[PDB]
Each structure stands twice: as C-alpha cells, then as structure tokens.
Amino acid sequence: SLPPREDAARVARFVTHVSDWGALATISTLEAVRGRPFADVLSLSDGPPGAGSGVPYFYLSPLQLSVSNLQENPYATLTMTLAQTNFCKKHGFDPQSPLCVHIMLSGTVTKVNETEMDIAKHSLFIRHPEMKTWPSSHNWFFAKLNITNIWVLDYFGGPKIVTPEEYYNVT
Amino acid sequence: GSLPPREDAARVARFVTHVSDWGALATISTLEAVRGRPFADVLSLSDGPPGAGSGVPYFYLSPLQLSVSNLQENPYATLTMTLAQTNFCKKHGFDPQSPLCVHIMLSGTVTKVNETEMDIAKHSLFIRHPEMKTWPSSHNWFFAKLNITNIWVLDYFGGPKIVTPEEYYNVT
C-alpha cells in the first residue's frame, strides 16, 4: 500500500517498484528535430515481487530511437505515475492531481556491467516474460538509469526533492 | 471503439490520442540543477468529448508547473501516449515495449490557445477531466495545445511509421 505522503523517499521507491513501464525523455538526434526533447515508452523493473531495489533496469536495442539519442546525449528523465495502476481511478484523482502520485527520476542511461548483468536480467525477465522471446537479431542489451535527481509529486505544493542517497537508503 | 488497421498509422495515431486521458511531455529543463537536460512529466489531456476527438492535444496548465517554466524558455516538446494506459496491452498479452502495445510520439510546440479556440479546449478538457473545474484559481490556469509537426507511430514490427500532420488531421 502507498506510504505516508510526507515520506517522499519511501513514496518514490514504492512508485518505481510498482511500475512495469514509464516514459523516458531524451534529446533527439534525428536531423529534422535535432536538439528537441523527445519522449518514448520503455518497459522497466527494479526487481522481483519482494525485492525492489529502486534501480530502473531497461532492455534496449541499438535499433531504438531512444538508444540513438542516448548515444549522443546519455541524459534522460524517466517519469512514472500511479495512473498506470487503478489507484487514481479508484480514488477519483485526476492524473494531473498531485494526489495521483507521480515522480521524475533524472540521470544518465548506461549499459549495465558484467557484475550487475544477472540482477538486471532477473529483475527484467521475471517482470517482463516476453523479453525472453524478443528477436535476437536486434542486439538487446541491459541498461539502467543512474539517478542523480528525484522529484516527487504526492501532495499539494512544490515537488518534493529527494536525494539519490535518501532514495536508495529506503528498505 | 476498437483499434484501427495497424497499416493506417494516421488512424491509429488518432485512436491513441483520443483514448488517452493523460500523457508524458518531454521538455528541456530550465532548472539550475539540471539545465539543458531532457525532462519528462505527466499531464492530463483531451482532444474532445466522446464522439468529437479532433486529434489536437489540449492541456490545462499553470505557470507554477516545471513543464511550463521549461516551455516559456523553449516551447519545443514531444508528447508520448501508450495503449498500456488502458487494459488493451494486458488483455492481449502485449508487453508495454512491444510495438503491438501501440505507442505514439507527437512532437511540436506547446502554445497558449487563441481566443477563438479557448472554448473548444475548455469544453474538450472539462468534459474529460471534471476535477479541473475545482482546481485553484490562484494557480492561473491557461488552455494550451500541442502544435504537431512530427509524428512517429509504433504499432507493428518493422520500426516506426512516420505520419505527417496532414495525414493525422485528415482522418475522419
């Protein structure tokens, strides 16, 4: 269940963990829209049913537009909302109401290293069983968001700012 | 209310825009801490009431919002919407990142709506989002729209399908 709204770090970890996907903002490298912000929908997982770590893992292909973008500028902002569940519908909260909790995680997106490759794979493949069947020729790699900044919109008033250290220090 | 033929990417894009009550808007951040970084954020939207979706994404925005402070400095933005916002992808067994779980990106500028278009924006938004009638006047809400110059549709294998604004708006 949703953590107390005053505990922003806990709220962020709750929302990251319950999201199976989110929207990732990048800078376009396409010549026609070069330099303009771009948005895209990615599947994600921070871990299996009882062990969400807050780390957003992705499974990506060099063919993807967002990956072309990250090759030229690896900064990205991921946004997730509880409107992705039935939470907001059930409470009658408009998706734009800060009662319909949403968060933004910004940082850089990198290919996961050898040590973390097994946890990334397991986190992603358990949550997304279709990935096992994706086409091998598209050259899939495991990636992650390295979070440097966090905004939490869970009540009226400004965004609540949470440090990566505070976010990762949650159980 | 079923999904159009996937080959008709213009029709599919209009279908997605109309079934979406919200989307993710990407802007360039003007926050000191992260200036110049791509920023994403969740906005409510509407293109019309139930039988009059025009395809035009209208927003109800406040100068207090992070996205709006970004748009004042650079009005370029990209909105994305996915059928994973409904039960469509779960019911059919399409992973949210499978192109079969349709998602679209509409890129352009966000501007304040004209006097002559305020009423249609208002009617479109307030009917889809009745809570907005109760939002605080102190936030100085205004009606905004996305002016679309570029459209990508992910609705099948084989990569993105490009749709021109004129194809998208000529859908009936």
From Swiss-Prot, chain B:
Glycans are attached at residues 114, 147, 170. N-glycosylated. It is found in: Secreted. GO terms for molecular function: transcription corepressor activity. GO terms for cellular component: azurophil granule lumen; endosome; extracellular exosome; extracellular region; extracellular space; transcription regulator complex. One of its GO terms (biological process) is endocytosis. Keywords: Glycoprotein, Growth regulation, Secreted, Signal. The keyword Secreted applies. The keyword NADP does not apply. May contribute to the transcriptional control of cell growth and differentiation. Antagonizes transcriptional activation and cellular transformation by the adenovirus E1A protein. The transcriptional control activity of cell growth requires interaction with IGF2R. Belongs to the CREG family. Homodimer. Interacts with IGF2R; the interaction is dependent on glycosylation. This is Protein CREG1. The gene is CREG1. The chain holds residues 49 to 218 of 220 of the full protein.
